[PDB]
Model the fold of this input.
Amino acid sequence: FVVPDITTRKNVGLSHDANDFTLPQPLDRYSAEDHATWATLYQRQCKLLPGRACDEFLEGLERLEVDADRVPDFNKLNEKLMAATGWKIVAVPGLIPDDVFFEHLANRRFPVTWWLREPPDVFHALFGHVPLLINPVFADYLEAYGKGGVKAKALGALPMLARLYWYTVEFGLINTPAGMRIYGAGILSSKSESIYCLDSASPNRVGFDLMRIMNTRYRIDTFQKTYFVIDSFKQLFDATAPDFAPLYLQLADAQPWGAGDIAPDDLVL
Ligand SMILES: [Co+2]
Done:
């Protein structure tokens, strides 16, 4: 039997732009259970993350006044976000087309799935991704990433950019004099990956390298076998400076590294 998935069920009776896939945040659809689920997840992560999350993340939560006790009102969060970096969040139904996603980031709009899991959803999107948008360097990296979507799509290279996003925005680590810390949203909203990614001898931790990352496969249904480590958000933004076109064409005929591989030139940490 095939039954409707959560995206389908949550969006019953709602609409989305056929081009940019946005909708007004459906505030009336959040139940008491939803706000309680949000509060539980928020409390859980805030207990786990001190000394694991990078300091910029935890500061972003406070500066944006991300609600501890209910699903945040997107309009209200946008007041603080816009004043900080000129970014805003927009509600989407769930997974959206790539050109749409990129066009949003290119225009300093961060798409956020509106609905919450039952006890990627709004907790992952808002709690995991949004706090770093208050950091001007990180925000500029995301904008530059978004702007690269047009060229990538024209060259059939969206999956190569997707690897860069996965291994930075979703699963990135940042080294600090106080020790290794986390900036990837997929780790920051996770119950357990926050522990494994810093505490386990199992995963590789490899210095950030643009070409290497864009040549590296990933899997979505398991903890990462490799994490890439930056020294600063400036490293990410600076990585977007050169022309990616000749990089895509070189990668196109290469054999990608497996998710668990160490490459001969890796700086292994
Ligand atoms: Co994500």
